[PDB]
Amino acid sequence: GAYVLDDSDGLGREFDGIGAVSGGGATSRLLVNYPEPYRSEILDYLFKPNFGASLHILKVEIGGDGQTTDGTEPSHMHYELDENYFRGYEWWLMKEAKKRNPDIILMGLPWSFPGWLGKGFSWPYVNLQLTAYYVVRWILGAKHYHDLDIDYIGIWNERPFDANYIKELRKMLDYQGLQRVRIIASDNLWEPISSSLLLDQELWKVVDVIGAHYPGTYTVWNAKMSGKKLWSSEDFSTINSNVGAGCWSRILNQNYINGNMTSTIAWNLVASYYEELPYGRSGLMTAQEPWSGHYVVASPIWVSAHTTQFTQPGWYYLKTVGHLEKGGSYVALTDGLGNLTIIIETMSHQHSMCIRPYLPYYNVSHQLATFTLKGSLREIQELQVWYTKLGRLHFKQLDTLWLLDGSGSFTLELEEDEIFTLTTLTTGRKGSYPPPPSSKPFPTNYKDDFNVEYPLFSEAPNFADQTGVFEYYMNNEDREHRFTLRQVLNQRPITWAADASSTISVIGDHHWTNMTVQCDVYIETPRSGGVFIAGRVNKGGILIRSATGVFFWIFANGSYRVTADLGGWITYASGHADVTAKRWYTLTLGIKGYFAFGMLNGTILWKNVRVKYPGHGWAAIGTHTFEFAQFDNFRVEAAR
């Protein structure tokens, strides 16, 4: 009926910020090649203060060369003795975020690791000092090459922690002058990290934040007892429809109310990956068409604004937060400087389901709520008002509220699926850019000759690696193939996902069904080496081992094979071919209806081979195992 807001008995917990994840894996892949001004506009909707999502926190994957949900991300150390701090796109992203908001909080976390760290095993805890050296290199590089201060470092995403590793990581950080870097653990469930902190004083000292994933707004007794900051260090992961926006709205409030969690971080930041990859369109907004420039400022962007534009890390929650009599919730925060922000949501069960976990039904119905400002809040006469209605009206500023009658009280009519932000702050703004170009399919005629002498990014645009890692490569000693694309992994990573046994990068339009793919290929490994080109590739990401399609393989022992699957269990055709290592060949693969054909150097190798139909999927290139190979003059023409 009447809800009292008051700071007289003191304050709740310190608010640490709202953020999002870029990574786990290759979620920002297609953002980098957006033409201006659209690329920069997207970044503004995400990071510019008092504009759009105005994020307080950016968490990135520390690429480990393994598949990590929608692709692989390149490591700074592919091999022992290798160091390169300019691969991939996380450095660029962190810098773009920092330019817009210098006070943004930066976090890094590994999902996979390069295989060499395992010293023979697929395990990162074989040599604790070596693994810690690898991670700390990344942090130092962020500073030395990009002027980035990494604020938080994690352990091993959704995988076991080793208490001794965590201790060694703290030692190593301090030893390299990174005492300011804080450690969050263990990016999994509340246990066993929470109980481990109670049983081990030395571990307790080195862990600054307990970060749990998909907690369903709740925590556990051992975590409260630890006295540590508690973050939902990964949450959301729901399609950015109105339903997704409701889920985000509800957990933003209730993670603190129900679970004492003072930060929530959404996976993922922006859906810049092919939608038919796992968890498609599960970012705060959508930018999956760099070829057209089309992007969508999705609902969760404005849901974010309701908190992020009106709070900052370092504000405090009030003791006075809770649930509404007839459903929904309210939180309230101050800055200690007389400001006050009040965030109210009334998300109905049917329009706010997250994918993890699914909540049993709860009722929400029309209600009236009366708020009274006791303590030092009483001295406030006036509030700005922001309003959103999901279903749709977004981040609409309403008429200022006045409490001049000395009552220190006000009342609201609340329906379902609504958010209200009531704040003293005047700085609010629904940021706006002109609409971007209409959506368009991937170009039905496409080519890349990779002839770029000084590329801005380490890989050609639109190629999304799903196992292995592909990079621009310059070979001066050859004039006919001076600039190519090269697969650079020579051993399987310490994997997070189930990476394929063959490397593969996909590109184009998953809807494609009739297509002709061509590429010059070059096998580097004598006797045992092999490469392929492919069409109708129907799965990737964490499901990359499941991929079917039409795969045209050639091998350095003078053979070829046509398969239905990436795993090569199912044969469409096979035979001999004049193919050896260290020689350039042109491969052509044509697929139409029930039939396919393959060419070697313009000459037919196999023809009218029956394949499964109907079928559809991307084009692709790859290598038989984790082995060096080069590709050049890529072409695809397709019909959707």
Ligand SMILES: *[C@@H]1O[C@H](CO)[C@@H](O[C@@H]2O[C@H](CO)[C@@H](O)[C@H](O)[C@H]2NC(C)=O)[C@H](O)[C@H]1NC(C)=O
């Ligand atoms: C964690 O938050 C919970 C609320 O989700 C706090 O638990 C109590 O909440 C009830 C209402 O649900 C209040 O009446 C009590 O005052 C709260 N307990 C106490 C001790 O104040 C709990 O306080 C929080 N735990 C912390 C801050 O460690």
Ligand SMILES: *[C@@H]1O[C@H](CO)[C@@H](O[C@@H]2O[C@H](CO)[C@@H](O)[C@H](O)[C@H]2NC(C)=O)[C@H](O)[C@H]1NC(C)=O
């Ligand atoms: C509300 O928050 C604003 C934002 O910080 C406060 O305004 C700042 O106040 C500090 C010192 O109090 C000044 O140094 C800054 O120049 C102010 N900035 C702006 C943009 O005003 C403000 O004090 C808070 N309280 C009220 C009542 O507005």
Ligand SMILES: *[C@@H]1O[C@H](CO)[C@@H](O[C@@H]2O[C@H](CO)[C@@H](O)[C@H](O)[C@H]2NC(C)=O)[C@H](O)[C@H]1NC(C)=O
């Ligand atoms: C892909 O190619 C197949 C094979 O020709 C096309 O299927 C044929 O389409 C014609 C005219 O549309 C029909 O008369 C045939 O009966 C179809 N054949 C089969 C086996 O279905 C298909 O339409 C093409 N698809 C695209 C998107 O271009």
Ligand SMILES: *[C@@H]1O[C@H](CO)[C@@H](O)[C@H](O)[C@H]1NC(C)=O
């Ligand atoms: C929800 O609550 C309202 C009012 O309390 C009631 O009229 C309605 O029947 C309830 N709906 C369900 C599904 O329980």
Ligand SMILES: OC[C@H]1O[C@@H](O)[C@H](O)[C@@H](O)[C@H]1O
């Ligand atoms: O919900 C999808 C997400 O699930 C998490 O377990 C993981 O950390 C993310 O990379 C992504 O896969």
Ligand SMILES: [Ca+2]
């Ligand atoms: Ca070239």
